[PDB]
Amino acid sequence: ARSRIKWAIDYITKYFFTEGIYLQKRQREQRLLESYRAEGKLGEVQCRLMEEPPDRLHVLDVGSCFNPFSSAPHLEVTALDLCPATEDVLQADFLKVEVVPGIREPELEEGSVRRLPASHYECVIFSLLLEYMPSAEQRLQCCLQAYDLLLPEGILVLITPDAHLMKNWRYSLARIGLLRVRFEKLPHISCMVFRKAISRELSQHWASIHREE
Ligand SMILES: Nc1ncnc2c1ncn2[C@@H]1O[C@H](C[C@@H](N)CC[C@H](N)C(=O)O)[C@@H](O)[C@H]1O
């Protein structure tokens, strides 16, 4: 009876606060960048790193039917949904949202969220959302927008319903800068976390050497 909501809250706390996983992965990715540089495959790459996590994490719950994460301690949740079921969830079609730099809060037009702050959220949650998307092109679009919304070393929680697909998702997301850091099987669901690596070039290379036709 493990809830995807309880699993997600548990990981986020471990990642930023109680186990400092973000520092463990930083060191792992720094070691990987040195291994690639030592093979002549990569040279000078831009690396952007997070400061010490705040006491209140900025979380974006996309496809948030009812804002399950709003009550969690130390999570400032901004909730979005195409068909909100509760009054605390904002109306929006994520596929049409602009990721804007230079803004602090969502900007609404006609009651629908149309602009969100870039590199502002420590976490973005896609809990059983991507399968509602029609095409694969639009699923990837959701993750590309999440990467622009995340801060350096922020995380994308991806929960999907229930092989070679999960390794193709790892490849396709590593190609946009998101490396998988956790995979767990809960009843009828598969819970994964993807991290905005210190360098996109780094993740793009890991993907190139892990593509299997
Ligand atoms: N293009 C879209 N833009 C915004 N929200 C969407 C879009 N397509 C589906 N949704 C919402 O994503 C939600 C999918 C739900 N199954 C997930 C609800 C909740 N996140 C959960 O973990 O159960 C629905 O409430 C949809 O309204």
Swiss-Prot record:
<keyword id="KW-0489">Methyltransferase</keyword>
<feature type="binding site">
    <location>
        <position position="93"/>
    </location>
    <ligand>
        <name>S-adenosyl-L-methionine</name>
    </ligand>
</feature>
<comment type="similarity">
    <text>Belongs to the BMT2/SAMTOR family.</text>
</comment>
<dbReference type="GO" id="GO:0034198">
    <property type="term" value="P:cellular response to amino acid starvation"/>
</dbReference>
<feature type="binding site">
    <location>
        <position position="82"/>
    </location>
    <ligand>
        <name>S-adenosyl-L-methionine</name>
    </ligand>
</feature>
<feature type="binding site">
    <location>
        <position position="4"/>
    </location>
    <ligand>
        <name>S-adenosyl-L-homocysteine</name>
    </ligand>
</feature>
<dbReference type="GO" id="GO:0140785">
    <property type="term" value="F:amino acid sensor activity"/>
</dbReference>
<feature type="binding site">
    <location>
        <position position="94"/>
    </location>
    <ligand>
        <name>S-adenosyl-L-homocysteine</name>
    </ligand>
</feature>
<feature type="binding site">
    <location>
        <position position="63"/>
    </location>
    <ligand>
        <name>S-adenosyl-L-homocysteine</name>
    </ligand>
</feature>
<keyword id="KW-0949">S-adenosyl-L-methionine</keyword>
<dbReference type="GO" id="GO:0008168">
    <property type="term" value="F:methyltransferase activity"/>
</dbReference>
<keyword id="KW-0808">Transferase</keyword>
<dbReference type="GO" id="GO:1904262">
    <property type="term" value="P:negative regulation of TORC1 signaling"/>
</dbReference>
<protein>
    <recommendedName>
        <fullName>S-adenosylmethionine sensor upstream of mTORC1</fullName>
        <ecNumber>2.1.1.-</ecNumber>
    </recommendedName>
</protein>
<dbReference type="GO" id="GO:0032259">
    <property type="term" value="P:methylation"/>
</dbReference>
<feature type="binding site">
    <location>
        <position position="94"/>
    </location>
    <ligand>
        <name>S-adenosyl-L-methionine</name>
    </ligand>
</feature>
<feature type="binding site">
    <location>
        <position position="81"/>
    </location>
    <ligand>
        <name>S-adenosyl-L-homocysteine</name>
    </ligand>
</feature>
<dbReference type="GO" id="GO:0061431">
    <property type="term" value="P:cellular response to methionine"/>
</dbReference>
<feature type="binding site">
    <location>
        <position position="127"/>
    </location>
    <ligand>
        <name>S-adenosyl-L-homocysteine</name>
    </ligand>
</feature>
<feature type="binding site">
    <location>
        <position position="93"/>
    </location>
    <ligand>
        <name>S-adenosyl-L-homocysteine</name>
    </ligand>
</feature>
<feature type="binding site">
    <location>
        <position position="4"/>
    </location>
    <ligand>
        <name>S-adenosyl-L-methionine</name>
    </ligand>
</feature>
<dbReference type="GO" id="GO:1904047">
    <property type="term" value="F:S-adenosyl-L-methionine binding"/>
</dbReference>
<feature type="binding site">
    <location>
        <position position="81"/>
    </location>
    <ligand>
        <name>S-adenosyl-L-methionine</name>
    </ligand>
</feature>
<feature type="binding site">
    <location>
        <position position="63"/>
    </location>
    <ligand>
        <name>S-adenosyl-L-methionine</name>
    </ligand>
</feature>
<dbReference type="GO" id="GO:0044877">
    <property type="term" value="F:protein-containing complex binding"/>
</dbReference>
<comment type="function">
    <text>S-adenosyl-L-methionine-binding protein. It is unclear whether this protein acts as a sensor of S-adenosyl-L-methionine to signal methionine sufficiency to mTORC1. Probably acts as a S-adenosyl-L-methionine-dependent methyltransferase.</text>
</comment>
<feature type="binding site">
    <location>
        <position position="127"/>
    </location>
    <ligand>
        <name>S-adenosyl-L-methionine</name>
    </ligand>
</feature>
